Design an enzyme around this catalytic site. Structure first.
Site, short mmCIF file in Angstrom:
data_model
loop_
_atom_site.label_atom_id
_atom_site.label_comp_id
_atom_site.label_asym_id
_atom_site.label_seq_id
_atom_site.Cartn_x
_atom_site.Cartn_y
_atom_site.Cartn_z
CE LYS A 188 13.21 -31.10 17.38
NZ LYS A 188 13.35 -32.04 16.23
CE1 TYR A 189 10.01 -21.58 17.25
CE2 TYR A 189 12.39 -21.69 17.49
CZ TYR A 189 11.27 -21.07 16.99
OH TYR A 189 11.41 -19.94 16.23
CD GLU A 262 -1.15 -23.92 6.59
OE1 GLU A 262 -1.24 -23.72 7.82
OE2 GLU A 262 -1.20 -23.00 5.75
NE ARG A 278 -8.76 -20.88 5.69
CZ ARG A 278 -7.61 -20.57 5.09
NH1 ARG A 278 -7.52 -20.56 3.77
NH2 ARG A 278 -6.54 -20.28 5.82
N1 LIG Z 1 6.76 -26.49 16.34
C1 LIG Z 1 6.97 -25.24 15.86
N2 LIG Z 1 8.21 -24.76 15.64
C2 LIG Z 1 8.42 -23.52 15.16
N3 LIG Z 1 7.41 -22.67 14.88
C3 LIG Z 1 6.12 -23.02 15.07
C4 LIG Z 1 5.82 -24.36 15.58
N4 LIG Z 1 4.48 -24.45 15.66
C5 LIG Z 1 3.96 -23.27 15.24
N5 LIG Z 1 4.94 -22.42 14.90
C6 LIG Z 1 4.77 -21.05 14.38
O1 LIG Z 1 3.44 -20.53 14.55
C7 LIG Z 1 2.86 -20.33 13.25
C8 LIG Z 1 1.38 -20.67 13.28
O2 LIG Z 1 0.66 -19.64 13.96
P1 LIG Z 1 -0.95 -19.53 13.81
O3 LIG Z 1 -1.38 -18.16 14.31
O4 LIG Z 1 -1.56 -20.79 14.38
O5 LIG Z 1 -1.14 -19.57 12.20
P2 LIG Z 1 -1.88 -20.78 11.42
O6 LIG Z 1 -3.36 -20.57 11.67
O7 LIG Z 1 -1.47 -20.59 9.98
O8 LIG Z 1 -1.31 -22.05 12.04
C9 LIG Z 1 3.67 -21.19 12.28
O9 LIG Z 1 3.74 -20.68 10.95
C10 LIG Z 1 5.04 -21.19 12.90
O10 LIG Z 1 5.84 -20.10 12.45
#
Ligand SMILES: Nc1ncnc2c1ncn2[C@@H]1O[C@H](COP(=O)(O)OP(=O)(O)O)[C@@H](O)[C@H]1O
Ligand SMILES: Nc1ncnc2c1ncn2[C@@H]1O[C@H](COP(=O)(O)OP(=O)(O)O)[C@@H](O)[C@H]1O
EC number: 6.3.4.14
Lengths: 430, 430
Positions: A188-189, A262, A278
């Protein structure tokens, strides 16, 4: 036990680790690139070893040079800090295979949580709440993929297991196909969530605790700018629920050391997105509100000791904020390397300064732009914020540009003052 | 309420007061001598007024100039800090008579506790334990004075109400006569006591609380060098006993604001020697172990508000140490004014830095030699000490001499490590 630690990192976190070691009476080995000879922690270390030239690839990411440093110094353990090799399972595996203790989880567990699909599967098994999604990879049988998206509910988001949105069905097939270009899943977004993350520690004695949470929603380009703890709106009951699910997840997966779960947090519900296996940059806000020394606990746990307290011993008190002070233009966010002619750092009650920077230090171009973390504490969120504003107004970094003016705009923002702004708020404001 | 405060002091305490005001949204007026134009707090103040030339007599002790500053700025209150006019009842009296709030007790009470004989009488009435003594002035009928000394027990000490020892009777008459050269009293001479002092706050709502105690036994020439809290060896039961007697003494005497009851502490017993009717230099160690902001409470109390917590709300946690960093030769203790070319101040978890000094600041000759207070906190005394050692090793003050090497010798002293050394220990060691 642990008598000598290689600090396989640089900058502020390397100094943070050195300070913990030194408090514990643990000897330090600072491995450094040619450009970092003048880092504060290098200058304070018991032993120093140059592991390569300036570029990360040839120094701080140089696995055999770092292991060779542990070998020649007869070190017992290696602390990876954050970034660089800290979530590299091949490095963890080689460190342990070479006879040294990796200050972090086992390689198997890093790999497990390093892959989005397997990570989510493990959390699901452990009862940690996850974003509704495909629960496993998609094919490209399009009829089946359309059924699932429909189930989940648009808008959905296609994602690499190691990131494209779909707001309607007619866009889905080609949205998926092109995202592969490596495996993919969909979930889901969530459109207006906050970033709320739970700190844990788990030891080799079967213990695991949670240390409340941090809100890290103020972000730009997915990079955190200001963090706080606890997260506004979160009650102790909610904290104990999500927290306890996180600690038990640690046990199920055999987690070891410090880590963070997270979540995207929306309309009262938590949804897992990543476990950082970490220590994190923003760990100090949690230290301020719990009284735990997280890096010191990392070292104890690595030496075989139990976490030095029980869950019932931790009680959230007060509130804390952290501003990441970067050497960059406050508007363009272009990096601003060069010599700091004068540094004046702030102080007083409830002010903490974590920085390797000093008057006369030259900020190099080769790594990231962080030069300091300014952390404040107060009995209330309001006091922490005002204390942060005053500390920033006192701070002088002369010779380079910094993002201090950005922090000042954030802190005086009426929506931030109220609290609970979402992960898109800062980008909109700008 | 209080909207504008004149900071009738300088240096670190003036900065400390400015930070509290600013957190409370209170406007600041920095009164300063010609030599202090470049003080950090002056540079941060909302308004500045030069009250005279460099010498204390003609600036910070200039009562009509300071009051005139409050007048022209339409200030509401005057904060005297410590030293200078903070225990000058004529100043307090003139400030109130001129329509301003004195941030401190009433003039009557300053006078009461400013005289040793009347101070002791009031404590005795309040049930605060005192050194066995003449309880009032001596005559020079020698037969009667000899009877009393005999009662008290030698060695005794003759003392000005506004300091000579007698170890035997044959020395007493001339010991007294010559000490007058002004009234005198006599009390028991305690040979190996510690200096242990209880912090209180009392408000205009009939409340009074105690905030544990500090041990300030590391002294040279009656000047404190290192302070800590709580005092080693002191149990919560003992704390509540002596503490509660101090709070009730506040009520009986109509005390207002922050204050400290100083005791000589020997073989388990407390003996009153002085009430400081003002904030003290070493207040931050108490803040670290209780979570109270003492200067902020001073301001609230001055504005008419109640103390912001109850006695049952304060619980001592952890331990804290403070090193007074002075610009002086670490051996001769000769002052070391001049330009600080570079300052590097320490930081990290459990480290607090209270200082007005900055890179490029010139330490003047005209006032005292304090340039910073380095304060650490830990869960245990041992951690606070190690944290202090590491913070000192990181601290760089370039261009002048400091007493940092003295602090390093104190902290590594095996007797200090054990704790409980007496008020003569440091002078002997040197
Ligand atoms: N289900 C979701 N809905 C909205 N945004 C998402 C969702 N899943 C991931 N994201 C976006 O992608 C980001 C994670 O990107 P990523 O490069 O994997 O960073 P991290 O390593 O911190 O997870 C999240 O902070 C969010 O903004
Ligand atoms: N009964 C006593 N026995 C031993 N020493 C004493 C006694 N009374 C006072 N003193 C000494 O005199 C000092 C106080 O001197 P003073 O100039 O009045 O300083 P303060 O203003 O801090 O009291 C004490 O710290 C102590 O060393």
């Amino acid at each position: 036990m642990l008598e000598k630690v290689v600090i396989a990192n640089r900058g502020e976190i390397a100094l943070r680790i050195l300070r913990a070691c030194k408090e514990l009476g643990i000897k330090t080995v600072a491995v450094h690139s040619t450009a970092d000879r003048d880092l504060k922690h290098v200058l304070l270390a018991d032993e120093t070893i140059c592991i390569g030239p300036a570029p990360s690839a040839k120094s701080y990411l140089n696995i055999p040079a770092i292991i060779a440093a542990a070998e020649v110094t007869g070190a017992d353990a290696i602390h990876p800090g954050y970034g660089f090799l800290s979530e590299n399972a091949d490095f963890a595996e080689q460190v342990e295979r070479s006879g040294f203790t990796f200050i972090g989880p086992t390689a198997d567990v890093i790999r497990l949580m390093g892959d989005k699909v397997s990570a989510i599967k493990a959390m699901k098994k452990a009862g940690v709440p996850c974003v509704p999604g495909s629960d496993g990879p998609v094919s490209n049988d399009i009829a089946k993929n359309k059924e699932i998206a429909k189930r989940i509910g648009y808008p959905i988001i296609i994602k690499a297991s190691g990131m494209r949105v779909v707001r309607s069905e007619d866009a889905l097939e080609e949205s998926i196909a092109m995202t592969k270009a490596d495996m993919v899943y969909m979930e889901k977004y969530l459109e207006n969530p906050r970033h709320v993350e739970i700190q844990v520690l788990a030891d080799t004695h079967g213990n695991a605790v949670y240390l409340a949470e941090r809100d890290c929603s103020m972000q730009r380009r997915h990079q955190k700018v200001v963090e706080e703890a606890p997260a506004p709106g979160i009650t102790e009951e909610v904290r104990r629920d999500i927290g306890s699910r996180c600690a038990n997840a640690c046990v199920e997966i055999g987690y070891r050391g410090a880590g963070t779960f997270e979540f995207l947090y929306e309309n009262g519900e938590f949804y897992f997105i990543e476990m950082n296996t970490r220590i994190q940059v923003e760990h100090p806000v949690t230290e301020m509100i719990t009284g735990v020394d997280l890096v010191k606990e990392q070292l104890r746990i690595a030496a075989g000791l139990p976490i030095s307290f029980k869950q019932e011993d931790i009680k959230v008190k007060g509130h804390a904020m952290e501003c990441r002070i970067n050497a960059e233009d406050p508007k363009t966010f272009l990096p601003s390397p060069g010599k700091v002619n004068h540094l004046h750092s702030p102080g007083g009650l409830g002010v903490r300064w974590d920085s390797h920077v000093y008057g006369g230090y030259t900020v190099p171009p080769h790594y990231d732009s962080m030069i300091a973390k300014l952390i404040t504490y107060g009995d209330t969120r309001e006091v922490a914020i005002r204390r942060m504003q005053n500390a920033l107004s006192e701070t002088i970094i002369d010779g380079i540009k910094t993002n201090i003016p950005l922090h000042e705009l954030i802190l005086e923002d009426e929506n931030f003052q109220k609290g609970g702004t979402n992960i898109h708020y800062l980008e909109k404001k700008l």
